Design a binder for these strands. Structure first.
Lengths: 217, 212, 212, 217
DNA sequence: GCAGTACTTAAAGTACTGCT
DNA sequence: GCAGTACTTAAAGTACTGCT
């Protein structure tokens, strides 16, 4: 499943499905600081203030099949072609990438021994590093580090969490519709911060951002 | 996919997406193995290979699936005695703390990565090794769909401890291996569930009270 | 893989390695279609899609497989009459030339590609279209393992002529389609085998003499 | 299944299995100008002159997974590293590739209409182009053009046919052994002609040979 | 009795919503 | 009753030798 990426009225917009809770685009609601997924077709969204606690969590990627024609790379290229992302915008990004030399993957994942025991069972603490940044427009950008599945080493994944108040139409006080996708106008600052997130996530991601940004300049 | 269960269990080794998957230790982490493209080593590296079984306790509300089936079929044979059940039931009554009580923590840290606040997520795991080489793992995960936690029990069986020997050989199609379950593995698996969470414990206690 | 056989045959469409595979005309050539990743078009391009069946006549020495099963099950129902069989048997007695008689030729040519002599291999094919849109192909190949030739009969059925309609949709898992075999398709398939080679012809004549 | 490529005593040698008749390495015997495969474990090779009619037909490739570490590229690189293929050898090859501008795939594959009919069935002739070259050492080099399986366009495959008299041990008058592979010392001239065959086969293959030859120079 | 060989798509697999 | 979603290996498939 893919989100539709488009340009309209001077804005990059993407259409996010809200009835696919097992996809990389899922609607969550925070209860006491943790995100919990939401059945958008059985539970009908609240018509009140607790709606801000609801948000869309999107695991956003940059590259696919070694090409930069996927999600964030499609948004950035469209933003470039319609003058939404300027020359100085891209120039500032590459000078930021040239100065970045420590990455989120440098923190690693570690299993720490404990002085604790559970009725004969040894107790360990697996420590995973994450990076989080809140933007003034309301969105959150997350970077988590996990183990590479099929090989040794780490892989870093970027998340963006979009408050439901930042998308249209207003779902307040109603249940999602069948195959309902939602329109989200992407601020340029979020695209720059998303590219920043990939730059600092790992050296592998940075080289992908750099090679892509240099190709459109 | 299901496994068919001196208690004997037959484990599929050609389904890496299952709850039962072949792995090998590489750089200290479990890595999926392509059991049909790669010949298993015949040297000492074979000890690095193991079968990881995400073992369950119940299914369809009744206690006749995997571990609950082993334990009842073992207790019936006199393999697990009345005192074996009392000890586990006594052990369960002694248990207050569970791994879920530790929970998952996001500890704030005072470092910044180019305008990004850095945090650390702390996931707790219980681990126990048995003299014959098997490992029992208990891992904590956020309760999917709901608020809370979900605990899962894993058993890791070295490929050395199953028949036939896979050394110098690629696995066969729908290949299933012989593993004789040691008695203490069954009891340690139950104690793993008893300490996983109160929910699992009351579930284990209800089953052990049923056959005692 | 096998297909289950007004004569009705059920054809699997999610097995592109089979004798029965879904194809589409692209640049004038049959191209395998990924029936589960790609939604079939709902527009006029659907006519470009077809099922290619490498159909056989016999199996296990007896004539109750695919075409031989259709023909006997059709002849029994009165669908194929005695005169229908005589005409095919008469047609077979009229046939002298077969596609195998053409053989595969390597014609020498007087051109050189940077020190390499260029040749041309000439493979003969028999092709027939039926008014309802199906095609019958006969192709020649070197007899594998032995000296000689081997002839194979193909039938190409447009996706328009099968149910349900696959338009605007990806195929289902182990999906099988409805195809009602027209009577003249059965008779033209037999004539295809009769003209493929003397070996096939005597094979067809032996079967038609058995049910007449 | 892969053939073992090695260097020994100043020679590039490859070990060719002779009991895998369904692989890309198969033992054939010519009967009246066509190659026919041979069951090397039931039929015991002749102890006479008709042994020359027996040969090993090897569909040899150059690249695998976009890398040049496979079959012919492994033989050529080893030949390079042990001074079997010299600088002038590789230089002459690239100047030959720079001059080649017509390819075997330029002949195309065509279905020709006929004035012939087979009892109501239309008759066509499918014409496939092949290229063949005999070398003084006895081997034959073949290039056949076929249709690309999963896509439109052509793909060209190179064959080399090795007389059994050119390999050791002598299989004369005996049946092949279980898992028997056979030692074939590769003349340098055949490697150059094999690279030539890939150069003239298609423009796609030539760019692969050129990029590989320039990388080892 | 079964693999070897070739090559690519479709299937297996886990688990809840959600779709038609 | 079944797909949607995620992702990767193993299975399907054709047909004869050949292997263990």
């Amino acid at each position: 499943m893919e989100a539709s990426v488009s340009f309209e009225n001077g804005k990059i917009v993407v259409r996010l499905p809200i009835t696919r809770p097992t996809s990389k685009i899922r609607v969550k609601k925070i209860e006491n600081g943790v995100g919990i997924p939401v059945s958008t077709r059985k539970k009908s969204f609240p018509s009140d203030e607790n709606l801000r606690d609801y948000y869309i969590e999107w695991q956003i990627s940059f590259a696919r099949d070694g090409k930069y024609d996927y999600e964030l790379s499609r948004m950035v290229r469209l933003a470039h072609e319609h003058g939404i992302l300027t020359y100085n915008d891209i120039y500032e990004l590459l000078k930021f990438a040239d100065d970045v030399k420590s990455y989120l993957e440098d923190k690693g994942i570690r299993r720490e021994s404990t002085n604790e025991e559970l009725y004969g069972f040894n107790i360990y603490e697996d420590v995973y590093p994450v990076a989080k940044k809140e933007l003034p427009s309301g969105e959150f950008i997350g970077i988590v580090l996990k183990h590479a599945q099929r090989a040794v080493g780490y892989q870093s994944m970027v998340y963006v969490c979009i408050p439901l108040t930042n998308v249209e139409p207003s779902l307040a006080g109603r249940v999602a519709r069948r195959n309902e996708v939602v329109k989200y106008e992407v601020p340029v600052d979020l695209m720059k911060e998303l590219l920043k997130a990939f730059i600092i996530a790992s050296e592998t991601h940075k080289n992908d951002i750099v090679k892509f940004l240099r190709s459109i300049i």
